[PDB]
Amino acid sequence: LTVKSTKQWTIGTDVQGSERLNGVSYQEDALITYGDYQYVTFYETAPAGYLNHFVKVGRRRVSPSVGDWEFLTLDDYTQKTMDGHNMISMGISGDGKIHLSFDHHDVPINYRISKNGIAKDVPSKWTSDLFDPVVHELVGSQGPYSPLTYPRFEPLGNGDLLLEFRIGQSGSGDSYIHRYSASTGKWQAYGMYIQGDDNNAYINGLDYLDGKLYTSWTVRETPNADTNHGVYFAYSNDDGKTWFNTNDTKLTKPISTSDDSTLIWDIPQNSRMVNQEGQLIDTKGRFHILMRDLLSGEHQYQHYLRKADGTWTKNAINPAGLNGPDLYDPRGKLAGDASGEYLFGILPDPVKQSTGIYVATASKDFKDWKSLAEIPNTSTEPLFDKTRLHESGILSVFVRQAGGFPDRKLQVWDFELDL
Ligand X SMILES: *[C@@H]1O[C@H](CO)[C@@H](O[C@@H]2O[C@H](CO)[C@@H](O[C@@H]3O[C@H](CO[C@H]4O[C@H](CO[C@H]5O[C@H](CO)[C@@H](O)[C@H](O)[C@@H]5O)[C@@H](O)[C@H](O[C@H]5O[C@H](CO)[C@@H](O)[C@H](O)[C@@H]5O)[C@@H]4O)[C@@H](O)[C@H](O[C@H]4O[C@H](CO)[C@@H](O)[C@H](O)[C@@H]4O)[C@@H]3O)[C@H](O)[C@H]2NC(C)=O)[C@H](O)[C@H]1NC(C)=O
Q: Which does 198 bind (CB under 5 to 8 A by kind): ligand RAM, Na ion, ligand X, none?
A: Na ion
Note whether 40 binds ligand RAM by CB under 6 A: no
Residue 275 and residue 230 in contact, taking contact as beta carbons nearer than 8 Å: no
Nearest to 231 by CA among 251, 202, 256, 206: 202
List the 409-417 sheet strands across, edge first: 3-13, 409-417, 394-400, 383-384
Among 206, 360, 372, 395, binds Ca ion (CB under 5 A): 206
Residue 398 and residue 410 in contact, taking contact as beta carbons nearer than 8 Å: yes
Note whether 76 binds Na ion by CB under 5 A: no
Note whether 244 binds ligand X by CB under 6 A: no
Note whether 276 binds ligand RAM by CB under 6 A: yes
Listing DSSP states for 101-150 in one string gives: EE--SSB---EEEBSS-TTTS--SS--GGGBPPPBSS-TTS-----SEEE
Which one of the spans 55-63, 85-93, 260-268, 397-405 is the region binding ligand X (CB under 6 A)? 260-268
* Cα separation, 264 vs 274, whole angstroms: 16
Instruction: Let me know if 82 is exposed, middle or buried by CB neighbors in 10 A (0-12, 13-18, 19+).
Output: middle
Nearer to Na ion by Cβ, of 141 and 222: the residue is: 222
Q: Which does 244 bind (CB under 5 to 8 A by kind): Ca ion, ligand X, ligand RAM, none?
A: none
Nearest to 347 by CA among 288, 293, 300: 300
Residue at 290: amino acid letter: L
Phi/psi at 357 (nearest 5 deg)? Answer: -110, 120
Report the b/e string of 166-181 with b at 16+ CB within 10 A: bbbebeebbbbbbbbb
Nearest to 197 by CA among 117, 258, 268: 258
Note whether 82 binds ligand RAM by CB under 6 A: no
Among 9, 71, 126, 312, binds ligand X (CB under 6 A): 312
Note whether 227 binds Na ion by CB under 5 A: no
Q: Give the pairing type, strands 255-256 and 98-102.
A: unpaired
217-256 footprint of ligand RAM as x/- string (CB under 6 A):
--------x-------------------------------
179-208 residues in contact with Na ion (CB under 5 A) are: 198
Note whether 98 binds Ca ion by CB under 5 A: no
Which one of the spans 45-53, 171-179, 270-278, 382-390 is the region binding ligand RAM (CB under 6 A)? 270-278
Q: Which does 225 bind (CB under 5 to 8 A by kind): ligand X, Ca ion, ligand RAM, none?
A: ligand RAM
135-174 footprint of Ca ion as x/- string (CB under 5 A):
-------------------x--------------------
Nearer to ligand X by Cβ, of 37 and 287: the residue is: 287
Among 68, 121, 129, 266, binds ligand X (CB under 6 A): 266
* Closest distance of CB 313 from ligand X, Å: 8
* Closest distance of CB 98 from Ca ion, Å: 16
Q: Which does 84 bind (CB under 5 to 8 A by kind): Ca ion, ligand X, ligand RAM, none?
A: ligand RAM
* Cα separation, 368 vs 116, whole angstroms: 46
Q: Which does 206 bind (CB under 5 to 8 A by kind): ligand X, Na ion, Ca ion, none?
A: Ca ion
Q: Give the pairing type, strands 212-220 and 207-209.
A: antiparallel
* Cα separation, 149 vs 166, whole angstroms: 5
Residue 270 carries which DSSP code? T
Among 2, 18, 65, 247, binds ligand X (CB under 6 A): 247
Which one of the spans 37-45, 85-93, 203-211, 212-220 is the region binding Ca ion (CB under 5 A)? 203-211
Phi/psi at 262 (nearest 5 deg)? Answer: -95, 0
Binding site for Na ion (CB under 5 A): 171, 198
Binding site for ligand RAM (CB under 6 A): 84-85, 170, 225, 274-276
Binding site for Ca ion (CB under 5 A): 154, 205-206
